C-alpha cells in the first residue's frame, strides 16, 4: 500500500503543484539574485624596473601605493635610460585601488593577453616560446610584507599569426596572436595578491629568444560572483534538512511494514542518502577557514552523485520489467550496472586530476603540451557521445517497458485502480526521461562553460525535487 497506488488524484495534484512551484522558484532565484556566476575582469600590467641588486635574494615590486616601483614609460624610454634586459619586471597588484578580494569569490582563473609589436627585425621563430619567470605573493594587512605563494618557471608556446603585411608602415601594430591559459587558484583567502613576471633572455639556454618584442602583457581574470556563491551555499543549506526530513519519514514508514523490502525500496533509499551526501553544506567551511582541497572534493561529490544517479535510472526502469524479472540481488543486474558506475566516475577524472595537480603547480594545465589540448577535446567528444548513447539506451529501456505493460492491461474499483496506476507510471516515466535529458545537458554545459544565465540553481533544485518526489511516492500509505 504505497503512496503512488493508494493516493487519490486529488491528493496527488496539489502535491505535484507545490513541488513544481518550489522547482520554478528555485529556477528563477538564479536569474534574480545573480544572473551570471563568473565575474570577468581585466588588469593592465605595470612595467617596473629593478636596480640589479637582488640576484641572490629576490625582491617584490608593487605597481601603486606606498613604496611603489619606478615605471618605465615605454620600452623606448628605457633606451635613453640605457635599461638592459632582465631589468624589466612586470607587476600586477590583483585588487583594484580602494577595494579588496573577498573569500566569497571561491576560485580564480587567469589567462594572459599578449601585446607583441611587429617589426621586421624580430620575426617570430617558428616554434617561438616564452620561457616566463613568474612569482606570486599574498598579503592581509596593508603594511605587511609580501609572502610567497609560488615561484617557478612556466613555459608557453606561442600559437601565433599576423595577417597584415610585413611592410614597415605596419610595424608597431601588435601580433593578433592568442591568449594563453595562465593560472588556476584553488581557493581565495587573502585581501591582496601580487604577481611579478620576468622574461630572462639567454642565447645559451635558448630562453625567451626570437619571441618578438613583447610590448606589454595584460591579465584577464575570472572568479565566481559574490552574489551567486552566497545564494548557492544558502540553497544547499536549505535543502539538506528538508531532504533529511523526507528521508526519515520514508525510512520510518518502510520499517513499519510487516514484510521485508524489495530491491527497489532499497535502491531508492540509496539514491536519497547519496543525494544528501552531495547536499550537505560542507563547503561553508571555505569562508571561515583556510581549507584548500575542498574545491576538488566538490568534484568528487558530483562524480559520486552521478555514479549513483545514472545507475539508479537503469535499475528503476529495469525493475519495471515484469516478465521473469524481479531478481533478489545485483547479480541479476551487474550485467548492466557494472561499467555504468565506473563510467560515471570516468566523466570527471580528468577535471579532478587537473584540480589535484594544480595544488602543486597552479600554472599546470591540460591545455599546455598541445597533445594535451587535442586529447582533452577528444575526451570531451567521447564523453559526450557515450553519455548520449547512454541516454539512447535508457530511451530504449523505456520503449521496451511501454511495450511490455500493454500485456497487463490487455490480458468499478479495478477499472479506476489499474488505470490510475498505469497513469501514475506514465507520468513518472516521462518525468524520468525529462530529468535524464536535462542532466545530460547539464553535464555538457558544465564542461563547456559561455552560458550567462544561472540555471545551475534551477537544475539542482530539479534533482532535489525529483528525488523528494520519489521518496514521497514510494512510502507506504496511512491506513484508510
Swiss-Prot record:
Record-linked Pfam families: WLS-like_TM, WLS_GOLD
Assembly, per entry: Interacts with WNT3A. Interacts with WNT1, WNT3 and WNT5A.
State which residue ranges cross the membrane. 14-34, 231-251, 267-287, 302-322, 330-350, 379-399, 425-445, 454-474
Q: What is its main location?
A: Golgi
Classification via InterPro entries:
WLS-like_TM, WLS_GOLD, Wntless
User: What disorder does this protein's entry note?
Assistant: Zaki syndrome: An autosomal recessive disorder characterized by developmental delay, progressive microcephaly, and short stature, as well as dysmorphic features including sparse scalp hair, cupped ears, wide nose and mouth, short philtrum, and high-arched palate. Other variable features have been observed, including ocular, skeletal, cardiac, and renal anomalies.
Topological category with respect to the lipid bilayer: Multi-pass membrane protein
Keyword Endoplasmic reticulum (UniProt): yes
What protein is this chain from?
Protein wntless homolog
Q: Which organism is it from?
A: Homo sapiens
Function, as annotated = Regulates Wnt proteins sorting and secretion in a feedback regulatory mechanism. This reciprocal interaction plays a key role in the regulation of expression, subcellular location, binding and organelle-specific association of Wnt proteins. Plays also an important role in establishment of the anterior-posterior body axis formation during development.
Family the UniProt entry places it in: Belongs to the wntless family.
Lumenal topological intervals: 35-230, 288-301, 351-378
Please provide, in alphabetical order, the Gene Ontology terms of the cellular component aspect for this entry. cytoplasmic vesicle; cytosol; early endosome; early endosome membrane; endocytic vesicle membrane; endomembrane system; endoplasmic reticulum; endoplasmic reticulum membrane
The listed locations are:
Golgi apparatus membrane; Cytoplasmic vesicle membrane; Cell membrane; Endoplasmic reticulum membrane
Question: Please, one GO biological process term?
Answer: Wnt protein secretion
Q: Which residues lie on this side of the membrane: Cytoplasmic?
A: 1-13, 252-266, 323-329, 400-424
Q: Which UniProt keywords apply?
A: Cell membrane, Cytoplasmic vesicle, Developmental protein, Disease variant, Endoplasmic reticulum, Endosome, Glycoprotein, Golgi apparatus, Membrane, Transmembrane, Transmembrane helix, Wnt signaling pathway
MF term (GO), any:
identical protein binding
Posttranslational modification:
N-glycosylated.
Query: What are the boundaries of the region Interaction with Wnt proteins?
Result: 99-230
